[PDB]
């Protein structure tokens, strides 16, 4: 999808699980003889292809050994495919780690940098649908820090992060963009659909208090939604979404704003 | 960071190397050891992980030798393969443990700046306060002034450079024993150790000057910045959040009053500019 750091460790685990599993596999062959999204799609396709081929050599190798017409070529071919497999994983591994070295420690959401690097791609692959960026900024969060302390503030962010991650779809990623600032990349058919997604999240934030050791704390967020037109750079879009959000804060808070193609702002209902 | 990727590489190099090894044994029948000592005695944190896998590696090969000998001399048993596999998985466990440890320890280093992250400080603060004696400990919070403007003006890439640079400068301008942390997006913390509040404030105010007195170069020209800081004492047995909060209180008023200045909050919780 991805979001949430935990999701990545889960994979890397299963990658290392394959390494061990395929060691065992090789031992067995040796035993038996004696006894008589579009970003990460390429990496999986690659290793899937490698995996197949590896086993193919193993089968070919085994059959050749048994039927008494094996040749040094058969082992070298198997080893070629086996290292090709362990390459394919490694590539995938790295990619993940890199992408997810930029993962926010506090919340476990992806950081601005992840978005920066992936945005140009996400916009291109949005078609036929439209892409929208939703900026959320916690309302008077300083107060919350001033009132309860920073630890508590840290919890709110963790929680809010977790909630937002749960409330969003898989293909739509939630990013910790800033200190109190979040971005959700929404994909929809029209501006109205985007706004609905926007406005509903704001309600949910409002409608779900954040529990802590010492009790309960209610919050709300003012959001700014905007269209992402083809070939625009991220900074242009954010800026527009920021323009949207600011007016929302001017007008009362706890609300989702939207900035149209004409660069005119209107609150959503 | 770079130092770690170098290792992780060499760990994965062993996995491949030891696949080949196994293939050779299988081939021959049908017919790392050097790198470990070349790590250069590390510290007491990571010693156990290397000892562990070194031990595992040995044992693994031992089974392989025992296995091979048994196969050739015609007195091998299913036990021999299972024993070898036990040791082989024990080896791949030993690496994995080491791997994790590294990643974890090294996730908490800030990717962008290369300074330690908040989490490092969180975990080490209680310790740093205890070992401050006989000296006093102070926390210095720095927050770039109108950095949003800089992003809005030049873009985020440029903004990213400024932070990298500022980080680097601050690291150079601080003492070894006093650590600079990327606490937040535009927020830095320096843990100062001094004899009195005046000494701390001097350290504080001078850093702010340096930031002011050193423009940040980029591909397309030069960008000047400044920082408003907040310094505070750390009294024994206080938790970090209390101190930071106080240091934040100090900084905020500084921003209210004009910016590009170091503020200090006294034992009486009263703020004064340096
Ligand atoms: N004006 C001023 N600048 C300061 C002060 N403390 C640090 N700096 C600046 O920060 C740099 C880093 O100091 P270091 O990493 O402790 O590395 C230092 C430190 O280990 C040692 N050193 C320099 N001065 C002192 C000192 O007063 N006491 C001790 N114990 N060591 C010192 O020499 C190393 C190299 O120092 P530099 O090349 O000068 O580079 C210094 C200097 O440019 C200060 O109190 N006043
Ligand atoms: N504990 C904690 N505090 C943070 C963090 N990131 C940012 N903050 C603090 O949250 C505060 C947000 O300041 P704003 O005044 S801009 O936030 P508001 O919600 O009050 O702004 P708006 O009223 O919505 O315009 C700042 O003082 C930051 O130091 C964080 O990661 N952990
Ligand atoms: N892709 C996408 N569509 C959404 C979302 N939120 C609302 N919508 C659209 O608006 C409708 C939401 O339904 P209600 O929540 S109003 O029920 C659905 O039919 C969606 O088409 C959203 O978060 N992502
Ligand atoms: N390029 C880049 N920008 C960042 C980063 N971390 C935080 N920022 C931005 O820094 C900006 C600072 O906004 P503030 O208004 S809170 O900072 P100011 O300096 O304007 O606030 P003060 O006036 O100093 O209180 C925010 O818009 C953040 O998006 C970052 O890692 N890379
Ligand atoms: N612990 C600590 N003390 C400092 C620092 N910077 C300045 N001082 C004190 O203030 C003095 C600075 O002297 P000038 O800057 S006038 O040279 C030194 O003798 C120190 O005692 C500092 O960064 N950390
Ligand atoms: Mg806010
Ligand atoms: Mg600032
Ligand atoms: Zn398989
Ligand atoms: Zn070996």
UniProtKB/Swiss-Prot annotation, chain A:
UniProt key word GTP-binding: yes
GO molecular function: diguanylate cyclase activity; GTP binding; identical protein binding; protein homodimerization activity; zinc ion binding
SMART domains assigned: GGDEF
Organism: Escherichia coli (strain K12)
Physiological role: Catalyzes the synthesis of cyclic-di-GMP (c-di-GMP) via the condensation of 2 GTP molecules. May act as a zinc sensor that controls, via c-di-GMP, post-translational events. Overexpression leads to a strong repression of swimming; swimming returnes to normal when residues 206-207 are both mutated to Ala. Overexpression also leads to a reduction in flagellar abundance and a 20-fold increase in c-di-GMP levels in vivo. Required for aminoglycoside-mediated induction of biofilm formation, it also plays a lesser role in biofilm production in response to other classes of translation inhibitors.
Protein name: Diguanylate cyclase DgcZ
Cofactor(s) listed in the protein's UniProt record: Mg(2+)
Coiled coil: none
Gene name, Swiss-Prot/TrEMBL: dgcZ
């Amino acid at each position: 999808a991805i979001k949430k750091t935990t999701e990545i460790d889960a994979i890397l685990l299963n990658l290392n699980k394959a390494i061990d599993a395929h060691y065992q596999w090789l031992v067995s062959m040796f035993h038996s003889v004696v006894a008589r999204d579009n970003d990460e799609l390429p990496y999986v396709r690659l290793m899937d292809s490698a995996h197949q081929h590896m086993h193919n050599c193993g089968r070919e190798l085994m059959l050749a050994i048994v039927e008494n017409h094996w040749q040094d070529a058969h082992f070298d071919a198997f080893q070629e495919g086996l290292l090709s497999f362990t390459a394919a994983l490694t590539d995938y591994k790295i990619y993940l780690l890199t992408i997810r070295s930029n993962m926010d420690v506090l919340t476990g959401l992806p950081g601005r940098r992840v978005l920066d690097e992936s945005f140009d791609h996400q916009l291109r692959n949005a078609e036929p649908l439209n892409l929208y960026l939703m900026l959320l900024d916690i309302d008077r969060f300083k107060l919350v820090n001033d009132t309860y302390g920073h630890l508590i503030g840290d919890v709110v962010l963790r929680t809010l992060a977790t909630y937002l991650a749960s409330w969003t779809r898989d293909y739509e990623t939630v990013y910790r963009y800033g200190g109190e600032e979040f971005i959700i990349i929404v994909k929809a058919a029209n501006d109205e659909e985007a706004c609905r997604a926007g406005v509903r999240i704001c309600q949910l934030v409002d409608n779900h208090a954040i529990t802590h050791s010492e009790g309960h704390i209610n919050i709300t967020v003012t959001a700014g939604v905007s269209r992402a037109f083809p070939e625009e750079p991220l900074d242009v879009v954010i800026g527009r979404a920021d323009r949207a959000m600011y007016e929302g804060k001017q007008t009362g808070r706890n609300r989702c704003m939207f900035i149209d193609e004409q660069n005119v702002i209107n609150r959503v209902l």
